[PDB]
Design an enzyme around this catalytic site. Structure first.
Site, PDB file in Angstrom:
ATOM      1  N   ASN A   1       1.063  -1.274  -0.205  1.00 36.08           N
ATOM      2  CA  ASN A   1       0.148  -0.132   0.210  1.00 36.08           C
ATOM      3  C   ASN A   1       1.470   1.645   0.122  1.00 36.08           C
ATOM      4  OD1 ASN A   1      -1.990  -1.800   2.587  1.00 36.08           O
ATOM      5  ND2 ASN A   1      -2.566  -1.357   0.150  1.00 36.08           N
TER       6      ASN A   1
ATOM      7  N   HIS B   1       2.812   2.531   1.904  1.00 32.83           N
ATOM      8  CA  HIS B   1       3.669   2.711   3.302  1.00 32.83           C
ATOM      9  C   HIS B   1       4.428   2.154   3.970  1.00 32.83           C
ATOM     10  CE1 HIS B   1      -0.026   4.875   3.977  1.00 32.83           C
ATOM     11  NE2 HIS B   1      -0.540   3.941   3.572  1.00 32.83           N
TER      12      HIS B   1
ATOM     13  N   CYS C   1       6.107   6.981   9.170  1.00 33.71           N
ATOM     14  CA  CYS C   1       7.360   7.992   8.788  1.00 33.71           C
ATOM     15  C   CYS C   1       6.370   8.047   7.640  1.00 33.71           C
ATOM     16  CB  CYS C   1       8.093   7.258   9.076  1.00 33.71           C
ATOM     17  SG  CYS C   1      10.077   8.185   7.967  1.00 33.71           S
TER      18      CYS C   1
END
Ligand SMILES: CCC(=O)Nc1ccc(C)cc1O
Ligand SMILES: CCC(=O)Nc1ccc(C)cc1O
EC number: 3.1.2.14
Lengths: 264, 263
Positions: free
Chosen positions: B185, B187, B222
């Site tokens: 995804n 991330h 992050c």
């Protein structure tokens, strides 16, 4: 995994893992390169090793000079991929390791790879030709008749790669390896360099294209405390790029390569 | 891999790979964390998923709040490790996923892990309590009686972690994720944060000690274009206090503790 019936090649099946896939739910080129390395290591282990008895006596090692990978279909998360690998001597220049990747369910070839390896002294880092004693020690594990993953006459695996000229079209600066990027001997894993090359490809290319071919030349090793700059320039329905990795400080070349991407 | 006889837990075997090992020829803590994540994903898939039908309808996701891992023996390259995983509801607070790691040959427990997960709206990133409807569709896949990987009263997995004060004893600055650090995804993978924490441990500790326990709190995510500073201070076996924060404004992303045994 296991050696095939003739004992001249090795096969292994892998189930693609959730953390091994990218945005398209298919294995990244770095996951593929890690699987090529794992099947290569298992082949060497199965035949008694990739240092021979003579190589250990003279402090000699096999180092990658070139890696060439071509993927037609990336396996999806949960799919089983079967990889067959074998080695061949190339006279006194060095050795070659080849791979064929297949979809386990259909039996169709979904990728292929070839790599050129040279002999180097572990301590001085000086390249050297393969001696007859070393050649004889690994010929008993290699097919005698030529067996090529890329047999074609004008194939992409043997093309000369030029040096990228400044200014680069794209760049990714300040790349540093972490402990996960090191192998068991505390050297930067060869797959990390593939990742660093790809870091300078723009995200829009990554989002609309799939990587079909990557050819990488290894000139120098990046140390644990070195910093790298990744540079890319478009050289072209297909997109081609010229690549250069160099140390951030003095600009010493680490790698040069080319990538070919096809529209999704 | 497969669900066990009662369908309330999942088991899977892994052969440790050549690129998965460190300088001791044994699996790194990041390889272990990736295997915990893989056996967790396979468990969710085998029971029909880790978002339920109601979670997808309301744009709700499970996010890690805390990860706690304890390793007694790291599996060597070529060894088979068997991992058993299960989930449990913790009322409206969230859910817990636990793991037991075993040597396949001896059957001995070589490690254990526990993780606390909370519900978050994927768009606003606002934490929410677990609703009755969500607890109901999860409970049919969880043991009803408590089953804890860390059952001891007042164990290391439930201890409060303080904030490291400047100046840090050690630091590693300018850490950036690459595309290999992203999940499907886009991330940053939760295992990358474990690696970044460990980057500020001095190489002499890594060379003479083995990591026994790591507890990590997740405060903020992050981004792909963020830069992180990793900070460590010895609080003592060797124990360290850890902090990951954004390189610019110093916004906290994680805090943790590690315990290391002399080899
Ligand atoms: C030990 C056998 C060997 O050559 N291993 C190996 C390592 C790295 C790569 C990329 C390919 C490989 O095959
Ligand atoms: C989809 C199932 C799930 O929870 N997976 C998962 C992801 C990350 C980590 C660290 C552990 C995990 O178990």
């Amino acid at each position: 995994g296991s050696l095939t019936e003739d004992g001249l090649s090795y096969k292994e099946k892998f189930v693609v893992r959730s953390y091994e896939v990218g945005s398209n739910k298919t294995a990244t080129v770095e996951t593929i390169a890690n699987l090529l390395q794992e099947v290569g290591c298992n082949h060497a282990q199965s035949v008694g090793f990739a240092t021979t008895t003579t190589m250990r006596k003279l402090h000699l090692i096999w180092v990658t000079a070139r890696m060439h990978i071509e993927i037609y279909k990336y396996p999806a998360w949960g799919d089983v991929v079967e990889i067959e690998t074998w080695c061949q001597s190339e006279g006194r220049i060095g050795t070659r390791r080849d791979w064929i990747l297949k979809d386990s369910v259909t039996g169709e070839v979904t990728g292929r790879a070839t790599s050129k390896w040279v002999m180097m002294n572990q301590d001085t880092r000086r390249l050297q030709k393969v001696s007859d004693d070393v050649r004889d020690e690994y010929l008993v594990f290699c097919p005698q008749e030529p067996r090529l993953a890329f047999p074609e006459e004008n194939n992409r695996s043997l093309k000369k790669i030029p040096k990228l000229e400044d200014p680069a079209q794209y760049s990714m600066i300040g790349l540093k390896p972490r402990r996960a990027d090191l192998d068991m001997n505390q050297h930067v894993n060869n797959v990390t360099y593939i990742g660093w090359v790809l870091e300078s490809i723009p995200q829009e290319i990554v989002d609309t294209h799939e990587l079909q071919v990557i050819t990488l030349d290894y000139r120098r090793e990046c140390q644990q405390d070195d910093v790298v700059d990744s540079l890319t320039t478009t050289t072209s329905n297909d997109s081609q790029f010229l690549h250069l990795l160099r140390l951030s400080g003095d600009g010493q070349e680490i790698n040069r390569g080319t990538t070919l991407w096809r529209k999704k």
